[model samples]
Target: NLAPLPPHVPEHLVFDFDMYNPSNLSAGVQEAWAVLQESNVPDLVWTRCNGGHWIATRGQLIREAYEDYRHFSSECPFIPREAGEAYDFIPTSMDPPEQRQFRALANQVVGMPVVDKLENRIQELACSLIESLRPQGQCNFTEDYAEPFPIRIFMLLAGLPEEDIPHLKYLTDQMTRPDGSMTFAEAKEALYDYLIPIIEQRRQKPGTDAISIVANGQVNGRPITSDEAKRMCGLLLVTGLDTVVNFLSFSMEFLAKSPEHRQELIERPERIPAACEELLRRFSLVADGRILTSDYEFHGVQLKKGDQILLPQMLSGLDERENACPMHVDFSRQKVSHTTFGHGSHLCLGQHLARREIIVTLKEWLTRIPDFSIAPGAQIQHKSGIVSGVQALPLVWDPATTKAV
Candidate 1:
């Protein structure tokens, strides 16, 4: 189901992998991509899918490509080429030095200090939402809890209203996982349109919100421009809205099916933190790439300038070479490593907050509803793209089996 090999790319390196839709997708998104590590696949392969790009299937190559930004530039980190060109996010879009300026300001907003400050509320929100759902017996976990929990905490942090979530999330998702409903440009425009008025107002009467801080904050010793703030805030919102929102569903879906995994965490509350790391490694889901700066030989394969290579952040974690039995989940695994939060200078700034959110969800939810399972006969489906996600997670349990916490 692939077109003929392009004239330029050699045949042996062609793997014809599609990030958006994979043949093994029905098994799970992570499983689908793990196919890239199977015997027939090489350490580095070229996929003539998604406008033709290279893929690094091992942690060594993925890390090297990300670290060597000179050859593999972040100038165009997404596929289909145009979306990467239109990416334009602060720090995320720019390379080092220039990228570092915005990154400092970004860290100010979501770093350890911010996560520590928000810890109480993050825990409270998870408990509050779970307690409400405990007696329901069955809940569309995705809609009822997974979507609301982390997103609400994000709304609180960003000072955005709960009412605005639906539209804002739609715009962000279009950029990462389009549904043929809108182009990335349109999504980016709409996101900016929504933020511009907010940014302008915040500048006039700045509040304590994340947007206000960015809109009025300074970067590189100069006052941040409204346009610059919009771009940075757009990245903030997208990170806040998408990352944990989808990750939580994947984590919970796993817990629902694996009673042993769930019980281990429930019996040993201290392991929740370790479990969080293992889960992050196994379910790691962001796939972004960089464009080649010039024709160069990387690991013996010739890559041309302007050529794009999808250095999937997800693949590195799943690579068997990096973690033995990569697919198997082990909370006690002495060393768990992966590029789930990305690598090099572009590493995720919101990681601390994301981890706390996950940890709290696991500890809080299971305390109240430990005896839950995927709805009988429901086949969970996953969708893949720039970020992969569970299509739906319908979890069920008996109210009698739940605690009234």
Candidate 2:
């Protein structure tokens, strides 16, 4: 814990939450860092790593940063100075005006109509994957269901080949923690290289799929440029792929450990939807940050322009002041609000689709394998970051419970 700001933030407490710490998932696995219940750590702490910035220890300040976009621009939404400087992904990296323009064109393909059309496909895919693994009695659920389920759908939507899975997944992992194989710049370049040509092809001859829809879609009453198309498509791919996959892992891991919570959903089917909302508020699994637009005094500590601020989207609701019995998951909570999907003008554009995917996944999974748990003696690790998740979920089920058709 650091001393209070010399002049203004005397009561403000700053803690350097070790974002890069490998133990992050481990601590989450045990709810060791219920930031909602922070004590030893001071409120509104400053973390020096990743170009250093302030953290809103409570939901109040975190919401402030998100809502007050003028002060906290989303242009560079990552903590590390390098990551912020390097970030150029569209819609997400672009704050308003430009973001709104791209979103208009991109929205057509990812909007509610597309989601409604794709609902059955989503259900079919989930059941197909689960059914295949049903006979095993014990399966590496993460590898088997959680990852592939969302990735495959996103690939299909992007008109990319599932054969590209191995390569794409590897590149995404490099981006998540950087396997040292490529710099963020290199990986981003390679992705653009892969996307640009496909976008070029679609631009010339538009098709009915999401990619072509985006490739040929118009922005501000004019057709989108090929370069913009690539950036837009890239955003859709990563945004859709990463969040739902991580969300599944998160949901499943929580369900596995908290049998009572899981059973609550199983026993009272009507409660699943409410459970999903509460869980999302409680989990708020994304850890995204933004670049400081100008030298600003937040509460007290001075933040210079270009400094990166870490906003663990998951932390706010976890604050005890925001939710009673902070760690305890309560589906019945009447008013659930947190920055799980983010806040202000830059809130996640893809959240609508994400909600449907998660709701559908829960409804489907519960019907098939009503009861499952982390395989005994196996360790489960839940990760946190740009989009947090479970590294692995080894699950076991009873053979007799299987209503083998």
Candidate 3:
């Protein structure tokens, strides 16, 4: 469906690309978005799909926009207008000086030190899950390992019940990639409803969990308010539940199909970390944007204040300018560069935990079940939106070949 181009947008710059449903998406999400980087496409273009937003097609513009939050604001990070208006997550919604205050509280719960503390449990869980799955012969990688591993850990860290995952995840998904069944505000309110009583409970009786930490945590030398705690915790839930959940599936789907790549990681176990970086580059799958705070000319085009832009974080690593043979996964590539964790001040706070989860999965899965492939006659599918995802990953292999290690 085409949307009317804004009066200020030039006709030639209109690409009409749909981030939620790219034309080439059936091939792969990355391949689908790569069309923007084609020879004929400009560095920046306006899309009539998803309500006509500007798109920074290359890593250069994307990085620049993220760093210059002054001109490019986080006020409306999502497309479709309504969602961005409802997207009032703390730290992420705030800018610069104010953003840093809430971010400090976010860091307390999911920062590097927290990941370091959880290392033993993370390691223990990864192995336990892999060893249990080794004898299954065939598994839905997304549900069996991908979803539970990171999400369960996140739930434990947040002191949330496993039962709450269904509702919480549904709410998070709507904000990231709306299915049109519910509006953004509806979803956001639902999340707040779930968190309100929990925040009150944690405040009354604090614990070591993330929710408790944020509820009683300090910002700018003052204890955060209950409203602020709910907002921050909401952001924490979304980041923890969605980021690694999708990336893990992308990595495993690639590993299932590429024996050469799988063997490379299997033989050189020490190379798993590097492989993780390369995989992160190739399958980078996040797309969020900024709203122009003031009318400005960027790269010779006039952008109006309140105009939104889709800066796909996925594009940075995919840009040929940023990486040689951009589509290929090369574990030993000299320097794996990307803004997948985001760039500038709003870099993901839980990135250390995400890296640990990914590295552990690669090392543990390959060591036990080194040989696996997409279940024959099955077509692998991917969903596209603000946060792209693998629909399901059906992996098959012989149990006899898998070891308990």
Best by the TM-score measure = 3
Instruction: State the lDDT at 323 in candidate 2.
Output: 78
Please, what are the lDDT tens digits per residue for candidate 2 over residues 1-405? 322333422334445455554234466732644542456775567654444556666777788888777778778776555666667877777876567887767668777877888889988997787778777788887788778988888887877898888777766655555646787677777778888888888878887778899888888899777777887787777776677787777788788788788778888989887888887876667777777789898866677776567766777777777777877778889778677888777776677777877887787777777778889998776655556667878899896776543
- lDDT of the structure predicted as candidate 1: 0.90
Clash-forming residue pairs, model 3: none
**Cα deviation of 8, candidate 1, in Å:** 3.5
| Alpha-carbon deviation at 193 in model 2, angstroms | 1.4
**What ranking emerges by TM-score with the best candidate at the front?**
3, 1, 2
Listed in order, each prediction's TM-score against the native is 0.98, 0.92, 0.99
Model 3, 1-405: lDDT tens per residue? 788777899899989889999999989999999999999999999998877899999999999999999999987888888788888999888789779988887898898999888998899998999888899999999999999999999998988889988888899888777788878899889889989999999899999899999999999999899889988888888898887999999999999989999988878899998899899999999999999999999989999999998989999999999999999888889988899999998998878888999999998889899999999999999999889999999999999998886
Error of 3 at 54 (Å): 0.3
Model 2 segments more than 4 A misplaced: 1-14, 22-25, 29-37
Between candidates 1 and 2, the lDDT winner: 1
> Scored by CA lDDT, what does every candidate get?
0.90, 0.73, 0.90
- lDDT string for model 1 (1-405, tens) is 455566767888989889889889998999999999999888889887877888988999999999998999998888878899889888788888789889989898899998988989988888889998898999998889888998888889889999999999999889988998998889989999899889989999999878888888888899998889999999999898887989999999999989999889888989999999999999999999999999889998888899899998999889988999999999999999999999999999999998988988898888999889999999999999998888899989999988876
Better of 1 and 3 by TM-score: 3
